[model samples]
Target chain A: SGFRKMAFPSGKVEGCMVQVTCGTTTLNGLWLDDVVYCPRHVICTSEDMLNPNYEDLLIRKSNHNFLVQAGNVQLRVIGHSMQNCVLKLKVDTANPKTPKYKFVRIQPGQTFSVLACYNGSPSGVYQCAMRPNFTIKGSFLNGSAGSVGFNIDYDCVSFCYMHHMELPTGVHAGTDLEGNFYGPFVDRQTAQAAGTDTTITVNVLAWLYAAVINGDRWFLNRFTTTLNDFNLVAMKYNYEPLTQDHVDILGPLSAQTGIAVLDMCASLKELLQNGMNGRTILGSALLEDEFTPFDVVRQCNRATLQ
Target chain B: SGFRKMAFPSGKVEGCMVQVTCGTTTLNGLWLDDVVYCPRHVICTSEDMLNPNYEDLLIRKSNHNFLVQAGNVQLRVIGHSMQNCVLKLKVDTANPKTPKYKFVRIQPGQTFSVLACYNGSPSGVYQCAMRPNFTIKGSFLNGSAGSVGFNIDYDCVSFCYMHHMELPTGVHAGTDLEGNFYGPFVDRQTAQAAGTDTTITVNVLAWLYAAVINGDRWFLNRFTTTLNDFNLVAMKYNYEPLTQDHVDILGPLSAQTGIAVLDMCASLKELLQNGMNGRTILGSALLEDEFTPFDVVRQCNRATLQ
Candidate 1:
C-alpha cells in the first residue's frame, strides 16, 4: 500500500509555507490510506524550494536541525537538504532496564516521530545522527553534513537567534594630506603610491580613534564633511572620473582643514619611528593606548563616555 | 628611531578592549616622538585576544570586513586574524585621468587609511585584496582571508549586524508506541529496532504541525505534555537509566494519548502505501500539504490561522 494526496480544505490553498514550531502538533494536513497513516507536517516542500516566491520562507525560518523544549509532544523530524538524503532513526525503549530498541530508515519527505515528556516516558531519550553509509551527493560535504542529529534541553530558540548591535557612531573616514579622497581616487594607483613616500606623510585612518576621543572637534568635522562630498560625486557618476565641480570642493576644504590634518599625520608617523614609553600624546600613552575591555562593554550600554 | 611603550592615561587602565567603529577618528592615546608619529587606534589589542576573559569580545562583534557609508570619516582597517597575516592596499588616484596608483604593505597592528567620500576623490576607488605572496600560515586557507579589504557608501554598520529572530513556538517531539520514550530509550539500539518491523508502527514528529493546524486539540496537548516529561527525566539523570518514577509517567501518559496517536500513525502509514491525491486528511492534501510561503509570513506578524 502507498500514501495518497490530501486535498487542501476550504480556504486553504496550495504551495503555502507554514511555520511549524518544534513543540506544537498542528495538523495543516495528513497522509492516509487505511488504518496506518502519516500526518503532513507543513514546514516546507520541494516545490517551495524552487519558487522565488518562497525565498523569504527558506531564508528566515529555522532549518529544524536541533530542538530542546519542556513538554509532552509527538515530534516529526523531516529529512531536508539541498542534496538528496536519508536518515537513520534509533529508538531506545529501556527504562533503567534491558535495552529494547530498533533502527528505521527515513527518506526525504518521510516524517517520523518520538513520544516523550519531561516527567518520563515508556519511550527513552532520543538522539539522531547521520548514517555514513548513505550516498551523500555533493561537491563539498558541508550542505549534507548534519543529517539527523538534534539536541534537547538547552534553549534552542535563543541559541539559534543572533542579536543585532548598532555600530559605533561619529566614526569618520581618514584622508590623505594632498586633497585626495579615500574611497575613490582621481587615479587609484597614483593616490595609493603616496603611502610609500616616507618623506611625504599620508594620513593613517586608525588615528581618527585617538583624535575623536582626545576631543579634536575640527579634525572630526572636517574629515567627516569632506568624505561625504566626495562620496556623493563617486556615487553620482557611478565611480567615473571627477570634473571641476568635484575638484572645487576639495580645494577649499583642504585649504580649511589644512595643516592640522598634515600635523597629525606627520606626528603619528614620527611616533611610530621613535616615541618614548611614558610620554603622553593624545591623552593616552604612546606605547599604551587606552582601551575598554569588550567584557566590560557588554554589560553597559555605552562603551565610551559621552 | 624606534617606538616606545606609552603608559596608560589617568582613569584608563592597561589591557582594555575598545569598539572603534570605522569612520570615527578618536584618540584614546597617541604614539609620538618628534613630528612623525602614528595614532594608536584602540581596537582590541593582542593582549586582549590572549585572555579567556575576552572570549565574549571576539565572538560577538562583527569583524570589520566590508563597509559602505555616507558622509566623511577616517576608517582604519585592522589586519586582525588568528594567524599572523599582512595586508596589501591598492590606491588609485585618477579622476577621469591617467591611472596613478601604488601598493602599500600593512603588517598586523599596523594602521592605514584612505581618504574617501561618495562624490569622488583625488585618490580613486580603493579596494583591498589579500596578498597571495605573503606567508599566510594555516592548515586551511580561511583564517588569513580578506586581509585588507573594506567598502564605503553602503551602510556597513547595519550590513554587519545580524538580527536575532526567535524560533517558532510550540514545536513538539514525536514518539514511538509500546511504552517507549523518544529521546532516552531503555536501550537505544533495542528501541530503535522497532521501526524496521514495519508491522510495529511508530509515530513521526513532523505530524504535530498538521495536527495542531487541523484543530486536533487532544493530539496536540498529549504530545506536547509527553515530550515535556521525557525531556525532564533525560535532563535530570544526565541520560542515565530511568527508574520506575520515570516509567510510571510514561506508561500512564502513553495510555491516555494512546489510540488517537496509534490511529493517526496507522492511517498515515497506509496512505503512504497507497492513497489518492485529493483526499483531505488533516485539512490539506497528503501530496499537497498547505504551507504559507516565507515571503507572505515575513510581512505578517503571525504565520498561521488562529
Candidate 2:
C-alpha cells in the first residue's frame, strides 16, 4: 500500500512499493467474503495525491501485498487509474465447446501467475504513455487456444504520480563557516527565513573575536591559533573594547558583507558575489575575506610568520 | 493474484484457498511480481459464475494456486458444457518447420491427454455454462487441453455458484434436490394477500422427522441454543435485555419456520409419539429439579443470528 525499502539481490532497492499478488488470506474472520486487491502508500500514492509516510507504516505491510517467492515470481498488470489495459491476469479460458468445454478470464488489479521466475531485475523504467496492455500475451494462460479471456498485467508502471515522489521545497539550513562559537553580537539561532538555507555559513574569525575571550584552546589546532591567541593575549593586555579591538586586528573598516546574519546586525555582503572561504575559527579573518588556514598564519603572523 | 487449495493422502484438506507460491521470505515485502496460474475461486470466477470441488482438496494445493508438480501428470479434456470434442494443446510453436509443437486439445468432460506437465495449471475445464478464458497470466501452476495436465485427482471445485452462487442466507441457511440448501424455498410469502404460505402444510415424512432433545449439564452444547443465542445476540446485549424464552422454545411455532422450516417442526417424530404434547416431547430432564413447562409462549418468536 505504500513505499518501503526492499532488499533484493540488486542491493537495497529503496522506494519499492507494495503490490498485490493473488491469494486469499484471513478476512474479517473468514466469511470468505470477496474483496478487491488494493495497494496505496505514503509521501503519496499517486502522481497527484501524495500522502504522508508514518501513517502508512502502520497501514501497508509491503510483504503481504507482494508475491514473496525465493526463486519464481509473479508480475502485475495494473489497469491503474481504472483505465484500459494491463489490469488482471488472463489465467483462464473464456471459450466453451459449450460446457463440454470452457475457459476463464481476468480483471484489473489482478496478478498473472508466471511462476514468479523472470526478472529484468532493476526494472522500473517506462515512459508514462509507453505502458503495454493486452496487445500481446506469451502463452495459453495468457492467450490460450480455445481462449476467450484477454491477458493483462503488462502495465508494469511504478506509474509515477502513480505515487510517492513528492518533490522537496528546496529549503536549506547549515552551520556557518566558523562551524561553532557564540560571540557578543551573534546569537545561537539565526533567522530562519523560508528560502534561506537553515544552516548558513558563519565566520569563525568574527565569532572568535565576538567571544569574551575565555582564552580556552577551543579552536586550538588552527594554523593561526598561536597567533590569534597572541593577538587576544595582547588585546586583553591592552584592555581593548570587547567589540572594538577589531580596529587594529581587523584593520581599516571600509567594510561590506554578503548575506546578513539575522538579528546579529551582521551580514556576508560579498560571498554571494564570490566564493567564501572555509574552516576558520572565530574572529578577525575578513568578515568577508577569501582567506586560508595560512590566512590564520597571515593574521597572527602580522607580528611574525613573516 | 489467483486462487488455489491443497490436500492430503488421508484426505483431510483444511482451509484450502489460493496463495502466492513464488517470491521471497519477508512477510512485509518482496515484489517478485510475477503472476498467477490464475483460476479465481467460487462465488464468481467464470463468466457464468460456476464453481466446483472434491478430487479438489486432493490435487489443488492451497499453498500455491494449483498443483505444483515436480514431475509429470495427466490431462482431462472436459468439454464442460458439452461442445467441442478437442482443444489444441500448443506449447512452444505451431510455426512452420516446427519441432515446436505436437498438439493437445480438451473435450467436453473428457480426458485430453494423460501425463500433463508444466506449471500454469488449473488449466482446464468446461461444462456448457462453462468455458475457461485465458487473460491473466501468472504462476502457481497447471491445466489440460485436448491437454497436458494430469487427471491424477478428483475435482478442483469449491462448488460455488462460482461468485454467482451466493452463499447461504445463514437465514440461520440449506439441503435440497438441487443439492444447494436454498433452491427449494417457497415464494408463497410474495403471493400472500397478507402472508400466505408463511406457514404452508407439508407431508410429515417429507422433511426431518427432524428433532433432538438433549439435556446435558450445560448450555455449552446445543442446537436450540443456536436459535436462542441468535435472538439474544441480536437483541444487542447492552442495548436490550432478554425477557421470556421462546414459547415453543423456538418462540412461537410460527417463529420456528422461515419459509421452509415452516413445516419442519410440525413433522417431528415427537409430534406423533406424544400426540402433540409440547412438554412431553421437549422438557424436564429426568434429574433436573426445575422445569418451567413452556409458557411465555409468544406467537411470533424473534429470529436469531444464524
Candidate 3:
C-alpha cells in the first residue's frame, strides 16, 4: 500500500490560513498495491459550537487516477483537536447503506487522530470533502461570543495497487518564478518542501500569458509566423503588444518624431510589399499610418474622388 | 451526413403484419436511424399504460422549419393512434434555455421524419422518444366503447442517440443489443390484434458462485509424475449457472453464437497460484446439484465435528 502522511503544526496563528497546491504527478511505470492518505481536520474555538465552516475542504485526484489500480479508500479517524468538539468523517462511496464514522466529545487543545486503511481498487474518479466544527468564546461586551472556525479544501492524493514496480526516478526539483530548480535535500521533508515550491511555481505559471509575449520579440515573431499560416497574421500583428513593437521598430525608417521603432518595422514591411510586388507606396500625407500597397491604392482612389 | 426514410403502408389485415427495413443511405455509418424496435411493445395494451413494457416515445430530432445543431434532444407526443398526436422536438446545446427545436401539433398517422448531418465535429448525442395512443372497444353482454386511453407499452422506440466517438468501433451496429440499436417494431394495430405470436425475447444474464476440489490421490500422483515441480490436481469440479441458459447465452447470443463459441474456446486461462501449477486433471464428481462448492463446503464444515 502506498501511504502519505501530512502534518500541520499548531502554533499561535489567527486568520484563515489556506494552502492550495495543484499539479500533475507522472505515474509512468509504477505498479501501485494500494494508495492511502490521511484526511485533514480543522480546529475551532471552545464553548457554544456555532458558525462551523462547512465549506468542504476537498482533495480531487485528477483524471489520471484511472491509470492506477488502487482500490476505493476513505479516511477514518481514530481520535480530535479539542474536547467536546464532535468530529465526524462521512464516507460516501456512492453506496447508501454503509455507516459513516462519527466521534463526539474530542479532548480540547489535543490532537485527534485515526488509523484508517482503504481497499486499493481502481474503480472511480476520486474526490473527497472535509468539514471542521466551530466553537464560540463568550465576550464581556457583546451578547454573543466571537466564534472561531476553520474549513479546509478537500485534500486528495493519488495511489495505485500492483506488483513488481520501481519507484519514480529523478526527483523533480522545485523552480522559482524565474524557472530555476531549487535544491538537493538531506531529508525527505526538505525534498517534499522543495516539491511544494515547484507546485506553487506551476500554479503561477498559468498566469505567464503576458510575460512570454512582452519579454522577447523573437518569441512573438515565432508565434506570429506559426499562426500566420492559418490566416491569423492580421489579428496577430494587431495584437496590442505586437502593435507597440511595430512602432518601436519603424520610427527610425520614417524619420518621424515621437514615432516608436515598431512603426518603422511596419513601414519597412509595407515598402517591401510595394517594391517587390509593383504596387504604389503612399506617404503619410495620404495616410497617417503605415499601409500595405493595396491599402495605399485604395486610399489614393478615395482621395482623388474627394 | 447520412439520411434514411421508412414508410408503413396503411391497410387493414386480419392479423398484424410488420415489415422492418433499413433505408439505402447510412447516416454517419449507421442504418435505420429513426426506428425503435423492442419486442415488449407488441403485447402492450391501452389498459396497461403504466406497464413497464409500455413504449415511452421521445423525438430526438424534429423536422422543423429551421436547422440547428443539438447537444441533447428529447421528444414527447400524446394522442390516439395516428389522431391528434402532438409532437415536440427539443435540442439542447450547452444552454438548456436555448433549445434548437420546439414543434407542436404533429398530425397523427402522418410520417414524421428528420435529417441529421454532421461535419465530423464534436456534435452532441441525439436521443428520441415515442408513445402510442390507444382506445379500447369492449363488451360481453352489451357493446360499448369502453375507454379512450393510451397504450403505454404499445408506443415504439424508447430513445436513440448518436454514437459518441469515444465508443469502440462495431459497438454502434444497427443490430446491436448491448449497444443502442433500433427495432422490435410494434404499433397500436399490432397491440390490438388477436392471437398473434407477439411475444419478444427479453434476456438478462448474471453470474453467482461455483467451486472445485483437489483429491489427495490425484495430487500425489501428479507430483510423482513431475519431479521438478509441485502440482495440485482438482479431481472434482462443480459449476453452476445463475440464470437459465435461455436468458443468458441463448437470447442475446443467438445473433452471434460464433462469438460465444470463440469465448468458450478462449476460456483456458493460465492459473497464477503456486499450488496449482503443472497439474493433470483427474476424474471428478458433483458434490451437490443446487449448492455451489463453497457453500457446500461451508455447510459440511458446520455440520461435521472436526
The candidate that wins on lDDT is 1
Off by over 4 Å in 3: A1-306, B1-92, B95-184, B187-189, B192-306
Which stretches of model 1 miss by more than 4 angstroms?
A1-306, B1-75, B82-209, B216-261, B281-306
Best by TM-score: 3
lDDT of 1 by residue, B30-129 (tens): 1011110111111234344223232344344343531211114323333332211111111111112111222233322111111111111110111111
Candidate 1: Cα lDDT at A119: 16
Candidate 1 lDDT (Cα, 0 to 1): 0.21
Please list the C-alpha lDDT of all candidates, in the order they appear: 0.21, 0.19, 0.18
Q: Each candidate: how many clashes?
A: 231, 174, 64
lDDT of 2 by residue, B1-306 (tens): 111110101000111111212122100000011211212221112232222332242233233322221113222211111111111111121122111111122221121111111132221121111111100011111111111121112222122111101112101011111222223332111221211111111211111211121111121112233334433442432211222332233332233323222233223322322333213212221111011112112111223253
Question: How does model 3 score on DockQ?
Answer: 0.01
TM-score of chain A of 2: 0.18
Q: Model 2, residue B119: what's the lDDT?
A: 30
